[PDB]
Paper text:
The antibody COVA1-16 was recently isolated from an individual recovering from COVID-19 and cross-neutralizes SARS-CoV-2 (half-maximal inhibitory concentration [IC50], 0.13 μg/mL) and SARS-CoV (IC50, 2.5 μg/mL) pseudovirus (Brouwer et al., 2020). COVA1-16 utilizes a long complementarity-determining region (CDR) H3 to target a highly conserved epitope and can cross-neutralize SARS-CoV. Although its epitope does not overlap with the ACE2 receptor binding site, COVA1-16 is able to compete with ACE2 for binding to the RBD.
Here we determined the crystal structure of COVA1-16 in complex with the SARS-CoV-2 RBD at 2.89-Å resolution to identify its binding site (epitope) and mechanism of cross-neutralization. COVA1-16 binding to the RBD is dominated by the heavy chain, which accounts for 81% of its total buried surface area (BSA; 673 Å2 of a total of 827 Å2). Four H-bonds between the tip of CDR H3 and the RBD are formed from two main chain-main chain interactions with RBD C379 and two with VH R100b. CDR H3 forms an additional four H-bonds with the RBD, involving the side chains of VH R97 and Q101. CDR H1 and CDR L2 of COVA1-16 also interact with the RBD, but much less so compared with CDR H3.
Numbering used by the authors:
A (entry chain A): 334 to 528
B (entry chain H): 1 to 52, 52A, 53 to 82, 82A, 82B, 82C, 83 to 100, 100A, ...
C (entry chain L): 1 to 213
């Protein structure tokens, strides 16, 4: 047996941030070295644990979150950061234990006329709690006048589209992000390293 | 289409090393050889070496022997070429070139046919200790036929790429050779002549890109009006 | 190392003429010679291969001849897009060597330049420097004189020139002359003028502007 990390990273299509994907890895053995060996990873940070020690550790469960954000928003996937992605899209807790991995996806997620399939939430009445998902599309009311399902003055559709083109700068190019959560509960260890 | 796409332009300090990429597409990568040729600014061409993209055999010129390394990666169908202990006379554009296939003679002789039918775009490598600097783009607003353009000022190293309306506007465009100023930094100007009638009818944007600094600008060239105040 | 000498090193001809370039080898190289066309900024382009065989797509007007050590490359009737630097390359014996090159240029009738002037943009003035740009569009011959007059006084040593390479459609040149001052020095003067003298102009032509207007 081997835990399907290839299914998570080498997936053909990725999710939008506001509807970020979550895969649960359970009851198998995980070769972490395949990950911390690739020169493809633009970003690779681990909180509460080192990759070095990962192949010799045992966990109750692991969570692989997947999404696509633009280039200079990747710094928002870290404990204590704020910004539209960290506030209204994907939020990491302060005591986060896990890893953030990200690579440049301009070659696939960008099209000649611009890729508008990838979306993100701009407006929200409240910040998101850690690991909270919100896929609603109720009109955001920013004024005293209710909108009643129709957007107009100070009434907006909540979700906004990334304009992903191969001609955009490094900061506006799409990056694919995978977040590895390590749950260390009081239970049997189901996910462990080979050694 | 046969397609040889090289990596971006790059700067290194003297004594370092550069690894230039060459990606092949549109044919069975392994059945051919790849050659690396070098051209310094204002000089002729210089052959460097040959790589077998199936076996991995390598053969170099004596000048580069020892300090050059040619790599192959069949999975991604891309060749690599690394030069080490760089110095100022290694400032040049590097091309990867494909010639056709070698054959066997009626006698049983191996004959080569090394004439480069396909070329890459070229990778500019500049070797100097000066530090990378991104450009600043300013508009040269127009005043029959009207002239407008963009000034791409103080930047290092070469090159910058300038398009107009993202490649939509092409005729009448003059992009000038960059000039070293006393600063040690380069500057350049990209101009275009259009009908005066179009100045109000069409909009003109210069797309400047300088990836050694990871810089990209889309500058709006607005016509200058003398009687527009508030 | 086989060394290929290419001649002439430079040459100018008119549209419709025959062009003949020679490449002589240091050793007998059979007919394993190739002829490339390289236009400025682009990669070389194979035109002739194995001394005489026209490579697919290349027009009928290109020609190759020779065997042994002397070779010739011929253009039937020159056309405006033929300007480039041409190279000869041998592969008889490693290492593969190229010739020195032959720069090919068009001889054209005299065309007067179109002169424009660009005062410094406000965006740049806010950064502390001022760049005045004079542009000479589509002229021939290449030699032109650009004089910067600042309140009728002549600046020296603060400008720089840039020339495009000859055009592939009308065989003309374009010239850039940029004078860059500090903003403090820039606003010491009022009149900026570009006086241009060229063979096509019956008299020197001046384009001027008043700073602040
Ligand atoms: C995801 O991407 C590719 C799928 O082919 C894998 O890349 C390689 O990993 C193997 C070892 O397993 C190496 O031999 C190759 O050189 C790697 N290729 C490149 C281009 O780096 C990768 O391992 C896959 N892994 C996951 C977890 O999806």
């Amino acid at each position: 047996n081997l835990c399907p990390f290839g299914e998570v990273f080498n997936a053909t299509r990725f999710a939008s941030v506001y509807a970020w994907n979550r895969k649960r890895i359970s009851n198998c053995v995980a070769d972490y070295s395949v990950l911390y060996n690739s020169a493809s990873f633009s970003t690779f940070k681990c909180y509460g644990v080192s990759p070095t020690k990962l192949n010799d550790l045992c966990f109750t469960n692991v969570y692989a979150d997947s999404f696509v954000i633009r280039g200079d928003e990747v710094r928002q996937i870290a404990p204590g950061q704020t910004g539209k992605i960290a506030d209204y899209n994907y939020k990491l807790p302060d005591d986060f234990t896990g890893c953030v991995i990200a690579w440049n996806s301009n070659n696939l997620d960008s099209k000649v006329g611009g890729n508008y399939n990838y979306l993100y939430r701009l407006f929200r009445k409240s910040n998101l709690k850690p690991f909270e998902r919100d896929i609603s599309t109720e009109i955001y009311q920013a004024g005293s006048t209710p909108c009643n399902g129709v957007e107009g003055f100070n009434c907006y559709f909540p979700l906004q589209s990334y304009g992903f083109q191969p001609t955009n700068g490094v900061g506006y190019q799409p990056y694919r992000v995978v977040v590895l959560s390590f749950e260390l509960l009081h239970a049997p260890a189901t996910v462990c390293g080979p050694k | 289409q046969v397609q040889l796409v090289q990596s971006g332009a790059e700067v290194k300090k003297p004594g370092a090393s550069v690894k230039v990429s060459c990606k092949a597409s549109g044919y069975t990568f392994t059945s051919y050889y790849m050659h690396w040729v070098r051209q310094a600014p204002g000089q002729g061409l210089e052959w460097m070496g040959i790589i077998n993209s199936s076996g991995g055999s390598t053969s170099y010129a004596q000048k580069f022997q020892g300090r050059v390394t040619m790599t192959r990666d069949t999975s991604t169908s891309t060749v690599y070429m690394e030069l080490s202990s760089l110095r100022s006379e290694d400032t040049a554009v590097y091309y990867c070139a494909r010639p056709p296939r070698n054959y066997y003679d009626r006698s049983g002789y191996y004959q080569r046919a090394e004439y480069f039918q396909h070329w890459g775009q070229g990778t500019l490598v500049t070797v100097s200790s000066a530090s990378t600097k991104g450009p600043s783009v300013f508009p040269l607003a127009p005043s029959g036929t009207a002239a407008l353009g963009c000034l791409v000022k103080d930047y290092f190293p070469e090159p910058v790429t300038v398009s107009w309306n993202s490649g939509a506007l092409t005729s009448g465009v003059h992009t000038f050779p960059a000039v070293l100023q006393s600063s040690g930094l380069y500057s350049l100007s990209s101009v275009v002549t259009v009908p005066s009638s179009s100045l109000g009818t069409q909009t003109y944007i210069c797309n400047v890109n300088h990836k050694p600094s990871n810089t990209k600008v889309d500058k709006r060239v607005e016509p200058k009006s003398c009687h527009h105040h508030h | 190392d086989i060394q290929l000498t290419q001649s002439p090193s430079s040459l100018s001809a008119s549209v419709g003429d025959r062009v003949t370039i020679t490449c002589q080898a240091s050793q007998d190289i059979s007919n394993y010679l190739n002829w490339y066309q390289q236009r400025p900024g682009k990669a070389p382009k194979l035109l002739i291969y194995d001394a005489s065989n026209l490579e697919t797509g290349v027009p009928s007007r290109f020609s190759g001849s020779g065997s042994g050590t002397d070779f010739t490359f011929t253009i039937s009737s020159l056309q405006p897009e033929d300007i480039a630097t041409y190279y000869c390359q041998q592969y008889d014996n490693p290492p593969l060597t190229f010739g020195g090159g032959t720069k090919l240029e068009i001889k054209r009738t005299v065309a007067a330049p179109s002169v424009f002037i660009f005062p410094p943009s406000d965006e740049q003035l806010k950064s502390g420097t001022a760049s005045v740009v004079c542009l000479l569009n589509n002229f021939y011959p290449r030699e032109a004189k650009v004089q910067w007059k600042v309140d009728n006084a002549l600046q020296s040593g603060n400008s720089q020139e840039s020339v495009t390479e000859q055009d592939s459609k009308d065989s003309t040149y374009s010239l850039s002359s940029t004078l860059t001052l500090s903003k403090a020095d820039y606003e010491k003067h009022k009149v900026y003028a570009c006086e241009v003298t060229h063979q096509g102009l019956s008299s020197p032509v001046t384009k001027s502007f008043n700073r602040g207007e």
